[model samples]
Target: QQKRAFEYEIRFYTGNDPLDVWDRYISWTEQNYPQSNMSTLLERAVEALQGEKRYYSDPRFLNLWLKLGRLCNEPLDMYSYLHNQGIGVSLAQFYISWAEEYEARENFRKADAIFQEGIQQKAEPLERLQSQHRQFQARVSRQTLLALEKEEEEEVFESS
Candidate 1:
């Protein structure tokens, strides 16, 4: 409903860092994200881990937000969730949403930052509990690598 002049699309990049960070999204029943509610957070974390988008951004954001939701009621993480999904407005450099949320999609340094962030948070990322932490830290991240071929338009001649 907002930004009528803008177009909704992903400005794909090759040189830019690969996959956006967190793909997992946790579901919190309350208004904002927090981390105190361990039972619910654990529930969603387990659900996310079992699901396909487990390591991805939405799931990551939800899991992350809920973890934070349990810790703080500041609404920062919730705002972050909304912003990444373009729930309110168009995003510039929105790619950071993933790059910012989870471990390395392709960059170790960035992944380190995210890992450190998780550690800093009161509730650590769920993967740590599952013992996937070492494996995650060792490997590089995956990418879509599905480039969109530029299109060329031509008109067909009418039949005689």
Candidate 2:
């Protein structure tokens, strides 16, 4: 019955806005299915819409891609693919998420570079991106200071 209903919706959808139908369908599936099952459904949905250029800049579509990224083993690679396709290029969230992935991998330099790239592009919500970049720098600085302190403590102990 679930599969039947999904097919029916897709076939009979006549509204001017197809994304509305897809968004609701995906969200309903998320609520109804287990995580493993939902990933399969999500993958299908993403693939179905992947060729639609109209959705490339849409936040909803970008969100779907981001969710897919989380499910993938290499989210950084997914983000890079998104960049290559020009998906969400104008959205600050895209850059933020991409940079966060780099940060998670302890690639602080790449994270900083991503933020700079976004700033140079003047991505939307520019202020938020700028603030996040500042926060990232502060966090990296703190980590560096702690590491330096630990090294100094170890040196003193070794000398004694």
Candidate 3:
């Protein structure tokens, strides 16, 4: 199991034109890797993007961030794993939109924002599962705050 999770973030500065690149990718996959998972397919597509001579100079590369964030860090059904990756895209999109929500805020806030956006981006009727993320954020915040308070109290008591 991967001990920690992180994403491979690709930053692109191009505006709109990259869609063509994405389209070309979709087409290439359609022709070659039909029925492959979009997350992995998109990850490979990003590799191809880097190799493409046009992408390096296009200026879009500065703004574009393609991150193959993660899977469950364990084996899972194909659909579930792909769904998680899809949620990551939704999450990155939301954070990108709100910008400051993740800038330097608490982890809980970041997670909350992701969960809220996932509520909308998730496939319809998966709301219950999405709710769990919200619950997690709340719990994390509550527990963290309590821990900090306890630590502070312990410090005072120790000094006394």
- Considering every candidate listed, which one attains the maximal TM-score? 2
Clashes of 2: 0
Ranking by lDDT: 2, 3, 1
Q: How accurate is candidate 3 locally (lDDT)?
A: 0.45
Local accuracy of candidate 3 as per-residue lDDT tens digits, 73-148: 3312322433343322333333332322332244556556545665666623345535565556666778889999
Candidate 1 residues lying further than 4 Å off, grouped into runs, are: 1-105, 124-130, 140-160
Per-residue CA lDDT of model 1 for 37-114, tens digit only, reads 444544444443443342334433344544444455444455465445433222211222333344423455764554
State the weakest 10-residue window (summed lDDT) of model 2. 1-10
* Ten contiguous residues with the weakest lDDT in model 3: 2-11
Which prediction has more favorable lDDT, 1 or 2?
Answer: 2
* Whole-model alpha-carbon lDDT for candidate 1: 0.37
What TM-score does prediction 2 earn?
0.87
TM-score per prediction, in order, is 0.25, 0.87, 0.33
lDDT of 2 at 131: 94
The list of candidate 3 runs beyond 4 A from truth reads 1-42, 45-67, 71-106, 120-125
RMSD of each: 20.3, 2.3, 14.0
